[PDB]
């Protein structure tokens, strides 16, 4: 059916007037990448561009960027034709001119600096009316081709002349500003962004289509998470890209005025959104407008809450507006807000992971001239506790430090600042290090919800335990049909018991990483904090966070911490049950197995935990994590030493055979000792080398040589002389008798 | 609407209430419905604002005026009956309170069928399976589930089919069909279950789901059905029927299933308060939760109020002898008070399960509350065989299995330990099937053969090898000392205290 028309999609290449298509549809149209091809678009405009054949994009879909789609006056989902134009010409002088106020506050011969390198050896095909763009010097500016000596479209040549003159002319009212937030500006919430897309695509992109059917739309979205995680940014980008009218309802803006005035403002905003259907209503800081009903002290606040409820119900009965909200916690807002019909679906924006932090940093450094030493992978891996706007402030601090290092020290009395000095600014790694260390407050202190970077290779030994855990986790989620075929409900929990230091935490992290599932590790400090604070209800939202991050591995490190603080083996005269452990049991009983949220518990004292947690259906699998043997210790050493550069003279098998009954974390402490001795040796060698030659006044005397870049066997031998037996043999006997008593108990 | 009422000015809110009541009186017979009544009428000690109290009083006066001269029936909606002002529930104002409650599996099935009445859904929907799987979803939750399934179907069809061909018409939209995958995705990824409190429903566990304990089954059938199925016989004799029974014995013998099956046989709702709930009420120092627990049980008459792990509080507050304190507990005390305040005629039966009957307070064993101490013994050969037959009815098992032999190996094994035996063996079968599937997938991918498919199921059932491996893995159920303690407690049913 006319394999000429074709549908739109996003793009990867950053070059302008460039495309890519699937590999098979290159003979269907019978033209290759170099073939300059024209494409059609509404308002009767057609633009020529280079072509390419890629793979990712489907046969029915094209790839391009805003630079071209704007002049084409076309959006996504739309469809266009295509035709090869080998008749293109090596164009001669083709007049251009900057079309914007971007030129505001600029100097220097922009012509050369900005254009020549872009037009360098490009043969960038051009057609009159183009709005191509170029960026530099912490700025970005575009130019329109007003004239094509040959018309309508031609090729550029390095020989062609440029008599480029004139003054900045104005963007006709048909031009669309790119200031609107876009999905390219969202990072760290890719899953959340996809969820929002699938929620709001039908109500907004297809209003009449949804009006034809009689289904209930999602008209309430609760974006909850830490402040600064881009909730309003996500809402603005979604509304702008989908074309929905965005109204920024601010809680402080709402209830800043009089009570009657606040209600009138809310009603006017809702009426305007209804008039501009399809529209998106976003209410950031919804907890300010709508607190808990028992907590809202002022009658004015309750009246405002009720007015908002009535307005959103009126939207529900007769409107086409999707309401979005932002809050720190879902429970901080009124429970009546989350009532069905009002706020049906709550999206946990959450925190960005290492990949998410990398994406956010890349987004914020897109227009920032940054050096090659930035290694944003390393920054993101190091970055912890920073969410969204925290990384934005980090990038701003790095840029400001670079500017204060350059401007405040270079251009003082020479001559007034011009564009040349500002566009030459570069951001280095030292600026990012300083931003990380001295000038960044991490606003994140609660539980981390991310896919851990620890893999199976990061764990040594425990192959049988690895396989059993792989079964118990992957098989329910990777082969649900097999479990459904048999009459057995998959287990939703496992308990890890054994000597401390055997890697139960890494086991949970690796099983979460293998399934690409988020891991929420609640260590013993968190359990004891909830127990001592008499706040067992925190387990409720912990399990809610775990469920919202499905698939998730809900790890409870040091599950016996409360049982150990409330006495030792026999302890006080009380029993073994604990309030926080009890809340964990209640949540697990209330947790559906299908939710593919797995609970892993690590206990260094399995005998002191309450047997109620060992009842079938909660933690029926008691996986014993034994003290590593020779092969396991060798594998642990291999996994640990993969990071620290170690000399080949090291003998890991011999080191393991000396270490009788040593735990994995005790082997990492062995590296702590030996690797730290190597670091100290390097530092002392550096300082003595610095001090020795400073006495001799020699202009050229540099015997530069690295003392040692690796760790030799001497450091490991010193660690052996320092580090000693891992744990008492009595503890190992207790663990082995507990393993022997897996049954015939209670 | 409560928000609609108190959204306006205080005088304006009162005027709106008066106008609504006057219009309802004019349109008699009329129904006044006040959803979110707790918003209009909170607890009297809790309503901070004077405007809110004035609105509460205005509503009270308007409904009293309806009572004296009108023909209007007033209905109200609230999360909890106690969340509203107690003066609202005064006789003459709100005489009868209807507990809407939560839908059961059949109720969820009915709701799904209602919401799919106008929805073109495929034959693979198997809404029985969805409803049986659906837990924690109530009403509008299932409505949102159906909406999510429909929206996923639309986003799969419309967003991928009709892009540049031609404008949408009725033919493409009426051809839309909802599949099972959409319902699975709605269940898993895009549905928040708003239910976390106690479940009030008729359990699906029947007598056939329990193996053995025939004498216990008959005794429980008597103690429950006979007061409610033959009230005339009990009234003829001068004996008040018992309103409670205690189940004591080794854990894993199916006391929970006994309560569920006796609730199902009478078609009575079962509210199972497990040990976690009792310990939550004890640790939180909120013993008053037992009050509304018993209120929910009474409102669901006939009901079997099951208290699983009734010794959980007595076990957390020390072991056998424990601390220097006694055996009575605040939550157990509230349970005793509620049972003493519960009329037997209300046909609300209380069942208590204790794995440590010796640590519970004897005050709960006083006649009139839990006078019947039914011992749930460790299953013998016949009971174990029946338990295995009941459990294996769900998991497809090969006929080569020898349940009598398996029971005769399992000396002194509890029923839940036999279900753990299936956990082991049936899981080994599942793992064998999965590994066979993956190795079959991997083996032929090397050969570039256009047509080479030796399709055959590895094993659809569970063979005796899996059960033998489970026997090599699973071991003795419980210590013999515990069984001796249970048998001596049974021997000391009398001549104590
Ligand atoms: N995930 C993110 N990706 C990119 N930028 C972000 C992200 N989160 C926050 N920001 C940046 O933070 C700034 C303001 O954050 P904001 O969205 O107001 O925080 P909140 O979500 O609390 O409203 C924005 O200019 C935006 O660029
Ligand atoms: N088997 C193992 N293989 C590799 N690394 C390990 C192993 N066991 C422990 N480690 C590492 O050594 C350290 C000590 O382990 P630890 O966390 O105490 O174990 P656990 O969490 O079981 O108590 C940890 O930081 C962990 O990263
Ligand atoms: N006699 C029995 N017949 C059939 N199934 C049983 C029996 N006893 C227990 N089960 C099942 O095996 C599991 C273990 O029983 P459990 O619940 O521990 O018993 P109890 O509630 O008496 O402690 C339960 O999930 C139950 O469904």
Residue numbers in the entry:
A (entry chain B): 21 to 766
B (entry chain A): 270 to 766
Q: What does the article say, verbatim?
A:
In eukaryotes p97, also known as valosin-containing protein (VCP), or Cdc48 in S. Cerevisiae, is one of the most conserved and abundant AAA (ATPases associated with a variety of cellular activities) family member. In fact, p97/Cdc48 acts as an unfoldase that couples the extraction of proteins from membranes and complexes to ATP hydrolysis. p97/Cdc48 is classified as type II AAA ATPase, as each protomer contains two consecutive ATPase modules and assembles to a homohexamer with a two stacked rings architecture. The NTDs are essential for the recruitment of most cofactors, as well as for substrate binding, whereas the ATPase domains regulate ATP binding and hydrolysis, controlling cofactors binding and substrate processing.
To this end p97 F539A and UN were mixed without the addition of exogenous nucleotides, and incubated for 5 or 30 min at 37°C. The samples were then subjected to size exclusion chromatography and the fractions corresponding to the highest molecular weight were used for single particle cryo-EM analysis. The shorter incubation yielded two populations of p97 F539A: a heterogeneous conformation within D1 ring, consisting of a single NTD in the “up” (ATP) state and second, a homogeneous conformation in which all the NTDs are in the “down” (ADP) state. Both 3D reconstructions were solved to high resolutions of 3.3 Å and 3.0 Å, respectively. (F) Nucleotide pockets of p97 F539A state III: densities that accommodate ADP are detected in all D1 and D2 “down” protomers nucleotide binding pockets, in contrast to the “up” protomer where density that may accommodate ATP molecule was observed. D2 ring of this protomer is occupied by ADP. State II: Upon incubation of p97 F539A with UN @37°C. State III: p97 F539A following UN release (D1:1-ATP, 5-ADP). Taken together we propose that initially, p97 F539A adopts a two NTDs in the ATP (“up”) state (in D1 ring) (state I), a conformation that is favorable for UN binding. The inability of this mutant to transition from state (I) to state (III) spontaneously might be attributed to the increased Gibbs free energy between the two states, in line with its low basal ATPase activity. We propose that UN binding reduces the energy barrier between the two states, enabling p97 F539A to progress through its catalytic cycle (state V).
